Design a protein around this ligand. Structure first.
Ligand code: NA
Length: 315
């Protein structure tokens, strides 16, 4: 472009940035502006796709997809890591599907996990709000949006008529919740299905993640887990529309080790030979699984690889 023109564009981008907050406009090629702390997701691939190395703090987040997609598994990792860094976590549950043992195996401090099973939608969000305004929570997860049924509808239509009262109930709540989240620095993840009040969440959220099962991972001829794909369809902290893939193993969750290998070869830090993954002259293993297993059994070298990937990308 011309220099006389670039002055006015930078002026305009700045006015947008100042008038409506940072992230209001971005070139898709732009670098991510790194926050102090974030909540990692369990996949380095996703952390990278998110730009800022994980989920932002003090913001609303939506993770969505069909049933048995992996959306909750991603949400639970966010919880696990938030706790691992000394944070308190809450789980606002209107579905009653949570598996604590799976959550444990994946990394959650279940004993410490605050859990609430509310009577109504407004109660769910009212409780979340009170839990947030304490300033003691790092992460709160709402499972799920579709289950936030209004009092009136639960009481036999006694008190309302509008079929879209639930959407109105989300809208009101999110307006008040938004201020509480930024002040507190608390992350709120709303889990949502594809198949009630997701229209407001779509605009209030700073990150929206589209989660999908892509392919089954087999052991000879038996189902071990699923190849998962996530597109960041909305991102107010870094350029949107990035996507990542990673493995969710039944009983164990997102393989951090698999995602390190994938991004290892993606960045040329891990080389091939003949189905042989190698690192810094040493060999990790023959085939994808042996390398994965090697990194599990050698956590020190897995961290070397994690460190070596972040530094190369800022993250
Ligand atoms: Na679960």
């Amino acid at each position: 472009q011309t220099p006389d023109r670039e002055k006015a564009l930078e002026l305009a981008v700045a006015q947008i940035e100042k008038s409506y907050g940072k992230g209001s406009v971005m070139r898709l090629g732009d670098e991510a502006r790194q926050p102090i702390s974030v909540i990692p997701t369990g996949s380095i691939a996703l952390d990278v796709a998110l730009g800022i190395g994980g989920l932002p703090r003090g913001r609303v987040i939506e993770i969505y997809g069909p049933e048995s997609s992996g959306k909750t598994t991603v949400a639970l990792h966010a919880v696990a890591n938030a706790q691992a860094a000394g944070g308190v976590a809450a789980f606002i549950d209107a579905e009653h599907a949570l598996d604590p043992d799976y959550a444990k195996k994946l990394g959650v401090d279940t004993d410490s996990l605050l859990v609430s099973q509310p009577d109504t939608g407004e109660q769910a969000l009212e409780i979340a709000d009170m839990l947030i305004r304490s300033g003691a929570l790092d992460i709160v997860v709402i499972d799920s949006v579709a289950a936030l049924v209004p009092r009136a509808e639960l009481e036999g239509e006694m008190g309302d008529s509008h079929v879209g009262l639930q959407a109105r109930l989300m809208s009101q709540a999110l307006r008040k919740m938004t201020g509480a989240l930024n002040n507190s620095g608390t992350t709120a993840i709303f889990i949502n299905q594809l198949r009630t009040g997701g229209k407001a969440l779509k605009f209030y959220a700073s990150v929206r993640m589209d989660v999908r099962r892509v392919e089954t991972l087999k052991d000879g001829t038996n189902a071990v887990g699923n190849r998962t794909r996530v597109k960041v369809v909305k991102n107010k902290c870094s350029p949107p529309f990035k996507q990542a893939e990673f493995d969710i193993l039944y009983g164990k969750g997102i393989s951090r080790e698999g995602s390190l290998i994938d991004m290892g070869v993606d960045q040329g830090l891990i080389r091939k030979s003949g189905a042989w993954f190698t690192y810094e002259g040493e060999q990790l293993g023959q085939g994808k699984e042996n390398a994965r297993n090697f990194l599990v059994e050698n956590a020190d070298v897995a961290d070397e690889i994690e460190k070596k990937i972040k530094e190369k990308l800022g993250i």
